Design a protein around this motif. Structure first.
Motif, PDB file in Angstrom:
ATOM      1  N   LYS A 279       0.846  -1.286   0.140  1.00  0.00           N
ATOM      2  CA  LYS A 279      -0.061  -0.106  -0.071  1.00  0.00           C
ATOM      3  C   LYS A 279       0.890   1.293   0.135  1.00  0.00           C
ATOM      4  O   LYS A 279       0.540   2.218  -1.018  1.00  0.00           O
ATOM      5  CB  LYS A 279      -1.172   0.095   1.244  1.00  0.00           C
ATOM      6  N   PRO A 280       1.923   1.563   1.047  1.00  0.00           N
ATOM      7  CA  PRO A 280       2.647   2.681   0.732  1.00  0.00           C
ATOM      8  C   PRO A 280       3.394   2.803  -0.614  1.00  0.00           C
ATOM      9  O   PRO A 280       3.349   4.165  -1.229  1.00  0.00           O
ATOM     10  CB  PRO A 280       3.640   2.717   1.908  1.00  0.00           C
ATOM     11  N   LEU A 281       3.915   1.988  -0.999  1.00  0.00           N
ATOM     12  CA  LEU A 281       4.630   1.899  -2.316  1.00  0.00           C
ATOM     13  C   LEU A 281       3.669   2.028  -3.595  1.00  0.00           C
ATOM     14  O   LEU A 281       4.180   2.242  -4.752  1.00  0.00           O
ATOM     15  CB  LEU A 281       5.569   0.663  -2.610  1.00  0.00           C
ATOM     16  N   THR A 282       2.458   1.778  -3.592  1.00  0.00           N
ATOM     17  CA  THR A 282       1.472   1.772  -4.598  1.00  0.00           C
ATOM     18  C   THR A 282       0.743   3.305  -4.422  1.00  0.00           C
ATOM     19  O   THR A 282      -0.098   3.634  -5.517  1.00  0.00           O
ATOM     20  CB  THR A 282       0.714   0.729  -4.806  1.00  0.00           C
ATOM     21  N   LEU A 283       0.627   3.851  -3.351  1.00  0.00           N
ATOM     22  CA  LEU A 283       0.192   5.086  -2.991  1.00  0.00           C
ATOM     23  C   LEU A 283       1.024   6.175  -3.470  1.00  0.00           C
ATOM     24  O   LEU A 283       1.052   7.378  -3.927  1.00  0.00           O
ATOM     25  CB  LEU A 283      -0.348   5.356  -1.520  1.00  0.00           C
ATOM     26  N   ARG A 284       2.600   5.855  -3.364  1.00  0.00           N
ATOM     27  CA  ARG A 284       3.570   6.754  -3.786  1.00  0.00           C
ATOM     28  C   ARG A 284       3.621   6.778  -5.270  1.00  0.00           C
ATOM     29  O   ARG A 284       4.148   7.856  -6.263  1.00  0.00           O
ATOM     30  CB  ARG A 284       4.889   6.117  -3.204  1.00  0.00           C
ATOM     31  N   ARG A 285       3.409   5.452  -5.938  1.00  0.00           N
ATOM     32  CA  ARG A 285       3.621   5.446  -7.229  1.00  0.00           C
ATOM     33  C   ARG A 285       2.407   6.086  -8.233  1.00  0.00           C
ATOM     34  O   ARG A 285       2.356   6.567  -9.358  1.00  0.00           O
ATOM     35  CB  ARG A 285       3.528   3.715  -7.680  1.00  0.00           C
ATOM     36  N   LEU A 286       1.169   6.172  -7.452  1.00  0.00           N
ATOM     37  CA  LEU A 286       0.029   7.071  -7.842  1.00  0.00           C
ATOM     38  C   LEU A 286       0.074   8.571  -7.607  1.00  0.00           C
ATOM     39  O   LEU A 286      -0.794   9.371  -8.093  1.00  0.00           O
ATOM     40  CB  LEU A 286      -1.214   6.527  -7.499  1.00  0.00           C
ATOM     41  N   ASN A 287       1.085   9.079  -7.317  1.00  0.00           N
ATOM     42  CA  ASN A 287       1.618  10.291  -7.137  1.00  0.00           C
ATOM     43  C   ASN A 287       2.566  10.829  -8.331  1.00  0.00           C
ATOM     44  O   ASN A 287       3.593  11.851  -8.120  1.00  0.00           O
ATOM     45  CB  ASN A 287       2.064  11.004  -6.039  1.00  0.00           C
ATOM     46  N   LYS A 288       2.920   9.912  -9.344  1.00  0.00           N
ATOM     47  CA  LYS A 288       3.851  10.333 -10.236  1.00  0.00           C
ATOM     48  C   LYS A 288       3.347  10.098 -11.747  1.00  0.00           C
ATOM     49  O   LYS A 288       2.100   9.431 -12.122  1.00  0.00           O
ATOM     50  CB  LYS A 288       5.074   9.266 -10.404  1.00  0.00           C
TER      51      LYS A 288
END
Lengths: 64, 44, 153, 197, 61, 282, 157, 157, 156, 158, 157, 158
Positions: free
Chosen positions: F246-255
């Motif tokens: 979840k954190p690494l795919t919330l971070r990926r959806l801000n790029k």
């Protein structure tokens, strides 16, 4: 063990038949109380039946 | 013989390890009594 | 003559030679570091000349490390009680001496670095007092290094 | 909690002694055979190590007692911080006493042959070095603490008036008699003790 | 509150006296249990009647 | 959560409060308040009786389930009920005062058996039964209330929360304590005396599933040593997956604070993996 | 006789005490110097991430205990010598009761230093310099225990 | 001789100790840091479920003690070796008397962190990070006792 | 292998299971009762809401009672020394952990009922912390039950 | 013999003594500490005096719990008794004593704090009794444990 | 073997301990109540013989020790069984350490009641009513030792 | 065996204890009540020979110890039964550790009585009344020790 599955069939069919024949006034508490209580009654019956189906400990007493 | 359980060697290991543990308890009670002067670190 | 319990005293002497010396060095570092931190909030330019008590407390722990290393190179499975108790004495000597010298350096050092900020003439005073308290670890190191030389003879 | 352990150890010692005494086996708690069968090198090395340890824990004790009050008393009167260092010196000499007695004792510390190991002389020179290390380390401990206290009073009476340090140095002299008397007694005790043979 | 305790004293002691009378093995069946069934039933049934007297007397209160 | 409570709270009560005598007393003093709820409603209630009358329907169910479960046990004021036919017969000819065993004839139809009452080793059997009963009912309650999280994340239409929290939670819970609850039922299913096989211990089976994988001293089923390795790897792969999906795919959806999501997911992973062990023992 | 039955007792106590007393030392160093962080980062929270160095240097002491506990644990055996158990007891105590002292010193210096570093920012370098001398105590205990543990099973019979 | 009669005493007291001293440390960490929650969430009741972190990290210590007391217990047995009992006593002490320290360091940090993080919101991450450094001590005791318990019955005759 | 002094450890394990859990429950009841009787002088309506730390203390003594009864019904004259050691461990495991759970329940309950009268929202936090404090004794209960299940398993 | 040595009634006499000694200590603390609160809150409110003696009656029940188990261990002592009998009589004595001691501490502390504040608020009288019931079941549990240990003192002894 | 030589030791310690600890309890109960009396009736000396009830009830629990230390004294022989010495020690401790508790309770309730009974005149009935519950502790200890001492030589050989 | 060599040890430390623990209770009763006489008679010196009754009743229990120490002393021998040594130790402890209690009670009551008898002169007859109860605690121990010492060498053999 098949007399646990045979009771699971007649409890599960009864719960499915009550899911579709619940009263429309209070559906989410008719089919939630009655279907869950049949599940928990069957669970304690199956647990109290399978502990005595093939027991490892025999009852042992002196005074009889 | 002195004893069979409390032999000549066990009973003088438990004197060395009692003197050393006494010095340890004393030194740890010295370091436990070490407090900081907090008034010379605050602003007030 | 060389029993099975004889390397207990040498191993516990090697233990105590660094344990008691590090306890004394920790008291000398902590109590005199409280005085450094309390002094250098109103006069911070005295920070690196007040650092001498924790350096002397570190020299104490080096004196204990030397005895612990030199005892653990003379340990064996089949050493006598002579070697065992002489390693025990070499441990106890530098242990009590480093513990005492570290307590003395800790109690003198914070008072010295507090008096040095009020009176500048007390820096030479605290250094000349702490040098007398430093060599007490040497006075135990002498007996430790003399009992080390009589280990296997 | 320490008083609870002091009472518990006392109760266990009394119960063990009365159990060993009532059952007719009371001579099994045999302190004399304990002294005869423990190694003399334990007593000798323990006496040497406690001599040089307890001289230093009294010297370093006195050094902080008359060092911290010297530095506190030197804030207003900094003309004491070099003259009054003889109070550090008088409580520092009790460590060189224990050092020069520990080396003289360790000269009597050789390898004894196993056939005459628990002999009369080898056991004598373990007992003598043990108690002559104790009576020097403890005497230099108590002398260092007394000279530190009477130097801490002198360091403040010096900063009060300059003519008081000469009058209260005499108390440090009478306090430093004690370590020299322990120096004498520990050399008389291990005077007739031979080496380990 | 004595009428509630007395009604339970009727019911429970009557069932216990009937289980002693019929030699039920949860009451007589052990060695430490009493030997004669109806001898215990005769003194439990009289206690059931005593609690029935208490239930009738406190039922008119 | 008060719509699954309406059955499970009186039933988890009744598992702890199991007796037809005390249960009928509690049902009777609840039915006294249910039948008299019109005279007691228009009345000043003090706090204890307001607590007791506000829940006049929690106590009716707490008595009605206590009668059911104390008919499952043989516990009527701590006595047995010889209602059905026993599965154990005692020997007819035996000396007085000696220790005897019973021979198994059949199985008792409904509930626990009444030949365990005045029994020396009856309490060992009741310990085993009630411990495994508590394990299975806690497993059922937890895996029932864990599906409501999936229904919540599906109603919120968040597949990121599903793949980050529900699936790595599901195949971590079911791969360890679902396996324990299955193994209890499978040990109850096998006979272990007619088969002349050793009955496995299930405590040191789950101890040895994590410490020494692949080594099975008492075999419980065919293919145990290689399936427990698969279940162990499926449980251990979800400790980084639930912590890092979840954190690494919330971070990926801000790029959005990545520190407020990563630390929260570490705390969620530690808390959930702690609680899966800490609640099945609670 | 050289390899008795009670010989793994001292080895197990040496494996235990190396992590026990260094966890005590690291716990005091984390505790006492974390109270100071939580007291002085309610006013200046911008320097929250640089006051964490007493906590990190305290937690290094637990790693010093962990290394010696693993290296003593992988030398234990049923039929080991009593010499090996004595050396492992000494190496456990040499890390434990020295890292306890190092952790006491790190906790005291860190709590005295992070409280004084918010009033004087130049005291931070002095705090780091004192904490290095406080952490080399546990480093010296690590050196002594590694030199014992290399000597533990070398020429044993 | 090699597996005497008093051999499971050390194993049973290690299985006891690994939950006794662990629960004592976790109880200090729960009580001391629950005082801070019950003192600061009177002013700020919105921070109850946010400041519950030190109580949970105190409970994770007790979980570490439980998972070693249930692994020593199934390795117990009559006529086991004295080596096995000594290893189980060491693995009991390594979890218990280090989770005791970790629970001290969680409680007496977490109370100050809950006192401080109601005033400064930026201090909460620092509280969590210091509590992670305080809880890794009990994790290190867990690692030492698991590596020790792995060698309890490994090729023991 | 099964000596005469073997049920001494079992009797001490049967005693210590109830003794130390009763000490813990007594500390919890005393601290929580001082809290209640000082916070319910001015707020008597939430008297029966604050009795939950005292109930959480009593469940610790119930945990000790269960283990002491199960150890009591496994004692014997000619039992093994292994059985006595396991019963001693099972007594101490529940006792000295229920003592700690009782200390935590007493401290948390006092500090929570003295501040829950000021803030009504603190009650659901006090219950949540007391759950973590009561699971500390539940863990000792689990360890004691798993020990006592193996006290007579393969015993000669 | 071996199963029944000569020093075996020592543990039985210590178990008969401790069951009344530690319950008398607990009951004495529960009487004294909670009677200070009675004698302090009666100089202004003397009408509630026969109802504030609940924490001294509930503390004196602990001494009766000790007395019952001391009588029952006393009537099971014998010269040629088993060592198992003396062991679990010591166990019964400690189970009653050191739990009734804790029950007496809890009754004393709670009863003092309850009769100190029950003179101020009259609704706290039903609360302190409900807390003292939980403080007195702590000694009731030790009574149950000792009555179960005493039923096994001479059961299968040889 | 059943009647050893060291058997009168426990009987003599019981005969001493029966009166020693009851004298300590009676001394505490007399001392605190006497301080309470001598501090409560310098203003109202009319309550002097009224407030003497705690001193009397503390003096009764020393007569409780004087009874059993005579009944144990008149059953002490040279060739007595060890069972008799064990019961006489248990009886001496059962009276002594219970009358000590009764004396503690009487000494606290006595001055707490006579310092308050000078203000409220009807606290005297409550003081007597609490001191009866404090004196039945020593009465219970007397009952336990009188039931022990009736068995010390019942069926001895 | 029946009269061992270590048998006079208990008789010697029972002869010693009956004056040691008695005189260090008599010293407490003298000192603690004498600091109450010397602090009170600076204003009322006419009551000096009337307030000294606590010191006299503290000196009486030392005579109670002296009598029992003399009677235990004159029954010591080289070859005496171990029963006699146990009885003499019991008598010495019974006098000493109960005269210690009587001296503590006289010391605590006496200074409280003499500091209060100068404000109210009708408290002197109450001080005597409490002090007789405090002083009879040593007389009870003397009765126990004399009944022991009469049983010491009655039917001893070997």
């Amino acid at each position: 063990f098949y007399t646990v599955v045979g009771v699971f069939i007649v409890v599960s069919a009864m719960s499915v038949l009550f899911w579709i024949m619940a009263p429309k006034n209070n559906q989410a508490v008719w089919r939630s109380t009655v279907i869950l209580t049949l599940a928990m009654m069957f669970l304690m019956w199956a647990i109290t039946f399978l502990c005595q189906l093939h027991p490892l400990v025999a009852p042992r007493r002196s005074d009889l | 013989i002195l004893s069979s359980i409390w032999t000549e060697g066990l009973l003088m290991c438990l004197i060395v390890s009692a003197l050393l543990l006494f010095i340890l308890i004393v030194a740890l009670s010295w370091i436990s009594n070490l407090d900081i002067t907090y008034g010379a670190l605050e602003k007030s | 003559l060389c029993p099975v319990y004889a390397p207990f005293f040498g191993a516990i002497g090697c233990a105590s030679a660094i344990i008691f010396t590090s306890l004394g060095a920790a008291y000398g570092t902590a109590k005199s570091g409280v005085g450094i931190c309390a002094t250098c909030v109103l006069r911070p330019d005295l920070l690196f000349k007040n650092i001498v008590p924790v350096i002397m407390a570190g020299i104490i722990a080096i004196y204990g490390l030397v005895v612990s290393v030199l005892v653990c190179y003379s340990l064996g499975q089949k050493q006598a009680l002579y070697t065992g108790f002489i390693q025990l004495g070499a441990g106890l000597s530098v242990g009590l001496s480093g513990l005492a010298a570290g307590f003395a350096i800790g109690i003198v050092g914070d008072a010295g670095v507090r008096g040095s900020s009020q009176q500048p003439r007390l820096f030479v005073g605290m250094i000349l007092i702490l040098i007398f308290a430093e060599v007490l670890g040497l006075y135990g190191l002498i007996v430790a290094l003399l009992l080390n030389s009589r280990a296997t003879q | 909690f320490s008083h609870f352990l002091y009472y518990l150890v006392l109760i266990v010692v009394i119960v063990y002694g009365l159990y060993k005494l009532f059952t007719g086996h009371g001579s099994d708690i045999n302190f004399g055979k304990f002294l005869l069968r423990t190694s003399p090198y334990m007593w000798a090395n323990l006496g040497i190590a406690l001599c040089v340890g307890l001289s230093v824990v009294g010297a370093a004790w006195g050094i902080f007692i008359t060092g911290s009050s010297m530095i506190g008393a030197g804030v207003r009167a900094p003309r004491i911080t070099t003259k009054n260092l003889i109070s550090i010196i008088f409580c520092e000499v009790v460590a060189i006493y224990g050092l020069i007695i520990a080396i003289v004792f360790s000269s009597k510390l050789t390898v004894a042959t196993a056939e005459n190991m628990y002999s009369k002389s080898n056991l004598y020179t373990g007992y003598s070095l043990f108690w002559a290390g104790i009576t020097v380390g403890a005497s230099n401990l108590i002398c260092g603490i007394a000279v530190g206290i009477t130097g801490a009073t002198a360091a403040i009476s010096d900063a009060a008036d300059s003519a008081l340090f000469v009058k209260i140095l005499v108390i440090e002299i009478f306090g430093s008699i004690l370590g020299l008397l322990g120096l004498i007694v520990g050399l008389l005790m291990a005077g007739k003790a031979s080496e380990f043979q | 509150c004595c009428t509630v305790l007395s009604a339970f004293g009727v019911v429970i002691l009557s069932v216990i006296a009937h289980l002693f009378n019929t030699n039920h093995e949860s009451f007589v069946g052990s060695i430490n249990d009493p030997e004669d069934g109806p001898a215990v039933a005769h003194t439990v049934y009289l206690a059931a009647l005593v609690y029935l007297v208490f239930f009738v007397f406190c039922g008119f209160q | 959560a008060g719509l699954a409570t309406v059955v499970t709270f009186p039933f988890m009560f009744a598992i702890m409060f199991g007796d037809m005598g005390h249960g009928f007393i509690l049902f009777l003093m609840a039915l006294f308040l249910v039948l008299n709820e019109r005279k007691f409603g228009a009345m000043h209630r003090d706090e204890i009786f307001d607590m007791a009358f506000t829940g006049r329907y929690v106590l009716l169910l707490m008595g009605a389930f206590s009668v059911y479960t104390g008919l499952l046990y043989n516990d009527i004021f701590s006595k047995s009920m010889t209602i059905f036919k026993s599965g154990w017969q005692w020997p007819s000819t035996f000396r007085k005062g000696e220790s005897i065993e019973a021979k198994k004839t059949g199985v008792y139809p409904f509930g626990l058996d009444f030949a365990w009452h005045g029994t020396d080793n009856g309490l060992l059997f009741s310990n085993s039964y009630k411990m495994k009963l508590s394990i299975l009912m806690g497993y059922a309650h937890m895996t029932y209330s864990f599906m409501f999280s999936y229904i919540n994340y599906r109603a919120k239409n968040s597949k990121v929360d599903i793949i980050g929290n529900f699936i790595p939670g599901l195949v971590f819970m079911q791969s360890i304590f679902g396996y324990l609850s299955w193994a209890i039922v499978y040990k109850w299913s096998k006979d272990w005396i007619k088969d002349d096989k050793p009955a496995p211990g299930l405590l040191n089976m789950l101890i040895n599933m994590f410490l020494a994988p692949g080594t099975i001293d008492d075999q419980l089923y065919s293919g145990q040593a290689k399936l427990q390795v698969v279940l162990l790897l499926a449980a251990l792969v979800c400790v980084p997956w639930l912590l890092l999906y979840k954190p690494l795919t919330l971070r990926r959806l801000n790029k959005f604070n990545f520190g407020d999501v990563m630390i929260h997911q570490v705390i969620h992973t530690i808390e959930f993996c702690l609680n899966c062990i800490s609640h099945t023992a609670s």
